[PDB]
Each structure stands twice: as structure tokens, then as C-alpha cells.
Design an enzyme around this catalytic site. Structure first.
Site, short mmCIF file in Angstrom:
data_model
loop_
_atom_site.label_atom_id
_atom_site.label_comp_id
_atom_site.label_asym_id
_atom_site.label_seq_id
_atom_site.Cartn_x
_atom_site.Cartn_y
_atom_site.Cartn_z
N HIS A 80 0.81 -1.01 0.23
CA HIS A 80 0.01 0.05 -0.29
C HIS A 80 0.89 1.18 -0.01
O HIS A 80 1.97 1.30 0.20
CB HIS A 80 -0.98 0.08 1.04
CG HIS A 80 -0.68 -0.10 2.53
ND1 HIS A 80 -0.20 -1.11 3.37
CD2 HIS A 80 -0.67 1.24 3.31
CE1 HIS A 80 0.01 -0.82 4.51
NE2 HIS A 80 -0.16 0.71 4.53
N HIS A 82 1.65 3.97 1.85
CA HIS A 82 1.89 4.58 3.26
C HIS A 82 3.23 4.53 3.32
O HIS A 82 4.05 3.67 2.70
CB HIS A 82 1.18 3.89 4.54
CG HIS A 82 -0.20 4.28 4.75
ND1 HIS A 82 -1.01 3.49 5.70
CD2 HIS A 82 -0.83 5.59 4.47
CE1 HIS A 82 -2.19 4.17 5.45
NE2 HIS A 82 -1.89 5.56 4.78
N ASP A 84 5.74 3.53 5.60
CA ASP A 84 6.51 2.36 5.86
C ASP A 84 6.59 1.25 4.92
O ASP A 84 7.17 0.17 4.98
CB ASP A 84 5.92 1.83 7.32
CG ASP A 84 4.60 1.29 7.18
OD1 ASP A 84 3.60 1.78 6.63
OD2 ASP A 84 4.42 0.11 7.74
N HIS A 143 -7.97 -1.30 5.70
CA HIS A 143 -6.82 -0.45 6.19
C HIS A 143 -6.24 0.97 5.29
O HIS A 143 -6.23 1.93 5.85
CB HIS A 143 -5.45 -1.18 6.47
CG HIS A 143 -4.53 -0.21 7.01
ND1 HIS A 143 -4.21 0.44 8.10
CD2 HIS A 143 -3.41 0.26 6.29
CE1 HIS A 143 -2.96 0.92 8.09
NE2 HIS A 143 -2.45 0.95 6.77
N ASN A 174 -4.08 3.31 12.92
CA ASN A 174 -4.41 4.70 12.21
C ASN A 174 -5.67 4.28 11.05
O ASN A 174 -5.57 3.45 10.30
CB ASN A 174 -3.24 4.96 11.37
CG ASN A 174 -3.47 6.09 10.55
OD1 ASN A 174 -4.58 6.80 10.54
ND2 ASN A 174 -2.60 6.49 9.53
ZN LIG Z 1 -0.69 1.90 6.30
#
Ligand SMILES: [Zn+2]
Length: 221
Positions: A80, A82, A84, A143, A174
Site C-alpha cells: 500500500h 503509506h 512504511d 486499512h 491509524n
Molecule cells: Zn498503512
């Protein structure tokens, strides 16, 4: 089985013969924040499922596995958009490491100011690296709207990514970019697709089994 690095920020734990989990600690939010990914030792080189928080960590991770397994990291699967997961995209691109992702992950990455991964993965994509078989699967929003899971059919191992919470996760974490009303259906889509799972690797925390998917469904209630 477990192998750390200089500072303890990077560690790799063996699941099996050719599959290891890589975990790196972050710095922003909590006080550690440990993210998981996979390292696939194939006959054609090393394949990573997810990069790390940033380039500094992504470089270290690569150098650690390349020296240990004595082969180059050739491809990376981004689960995904994000930080990290895609944080070291600049490192991957400049070293000639193929950064696979769905078109949606690539689009989001670009929108957020990151270099673009390939956007080559479909809803269901089947890849093969040497001997290693890898299937990627977009099960729907959860998510994040773009989260995908990765399946290793030869081991019945599922990299759940951030769509799957570990036993330690007592909440959803989150949810700023999450779809809590669709996340359950997405989890069900994974359970329907993979009826027999040996191990499930969550986005963060301890490796488990089908139980983590059930744990996530509970967290969504
Ligand atoms: Zn994430």
C-alpha cells in the site's frame, strides 16, 4: 532463525527454507513502531514484500539481505501507499530494483509526492521468481483503499500487510485512510480465497494464522 543489524532497527526472522520476515523499527508516533515485510530467497535473486519507513532503512535492509543470501534484491512488492511500505521507493528505483504495485497504489503514491512504483499488479496477479511462486490479491478497501495481500501458494503463507492486525493490536490503529465499513468484507474476501493458511504475517506484530483475520474482524465491530 532471528538476525538483527548494527543498531537493532532491522531484523530478519526465518519462517522457512526460502522465506524470512523482515522487521524494522520506525521513530515518529509511538516510540518504536515495528513494521513487517517478507524476504524471498529465490533462484533468481531476492524478492522483498514491502520496503521500509525511509531510504536509510531500505538501503540497510537491502545490504543486509544481499550480503547474507549472496544474491541481489531484484524486485519489491509494495502492499500500500503509506510511508512504511513505500518510503524507500527512491532507493529501489535508483538501484534498478523493480517496484511492483497496483495502479491504485502507484496513483496514490504519486499524489502523495513519492516516486511511482510500477502499477503493474491487477486484482489477482501471479508472479514467479525462479522457483518461488507469488500471487498478489486486491481484496477491496480496508486499512487503506489500496491495500493488497500477498500469497505464497507453495507454502500457504499469507502476507496480510496492514489489512491484518496482530494479536497485540487491541485497536485498529491509524484509520485516517481506512474504510471501516468495507474492511470486514475485504477480510472475508481473503478468507474465501485462501481457505487453508499455514501462517499469516501482519503489517506489524507477531506472525500468526487465520486467527489474525478473525481478530481483525472483531476489531472492526
Ligand atoms: Zn498503512
Amino acid at each position: 532463525t532471528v538476525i538483527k543489524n548494527e543498531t537493532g532497527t532491522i531484523s530478519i526472522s526465518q519462517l522457512n527454507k526460502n522465506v524470512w520476515v523482515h522487521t524494522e523499527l520506525g521513530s515518529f508516533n509511538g516510540e518504536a513502531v515495528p513494521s513487517n515485510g517478507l524476504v524471498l530467497n529465490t533462484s533468481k535473486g531476492l524478492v522483498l514484500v514491502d520496503s521500509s519507513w525511509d531510504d536509510k532503512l531500505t538501503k540497510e535492509l537491502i545490504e543486509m539481505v544481499e550480503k547474507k543470501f549472496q544474491k541481489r534484491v531484484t524486485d519489491v512488492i509494495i502492499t500500500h501507499a503509506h510511508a512504511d511500505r513505500i518510503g524507500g521507493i527512491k532507493t529501489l528505483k535508483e538501484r534498478g530494483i523493480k517496484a511492483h504495485s497496483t495502479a491504485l497504489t502507484a496513483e496514490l503514491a504519486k499524489k502523495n509526492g513519492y516516486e511511482e512504483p510500477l502499477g503493474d499488479l491487477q486484482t489477482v496477479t501471479n508472479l514467479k521468481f525462479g522457483n518461488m511462486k507469488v500471487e498478489t490479491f486486491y481484496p477491496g478497501k480496508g486499512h487503506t483503499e489500496d491495500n493488497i495481500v500477498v500469497w505464497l501458494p507453495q507454502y500457504n503463507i499469507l502476507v496480510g500487510g496492514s489489512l491484518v492486525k496482530s494479536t497485540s493490536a487491541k485497536d485498529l490503529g491509524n484509520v485516517a485512510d481506512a474504510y471501516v465499513n468495507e474492511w470486514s468484507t475485504s477480510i472475508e474476501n481473503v478468507l474465501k480465497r485462501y481457505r487453508n493458511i499455514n501462517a499469516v504475517v501482519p503489517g506489524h506484530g507477531e506472525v500468526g494464522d487465520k486467527g489474525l483475520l478473525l481478530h481483525t474482524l472483531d476489531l472492526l465491530k
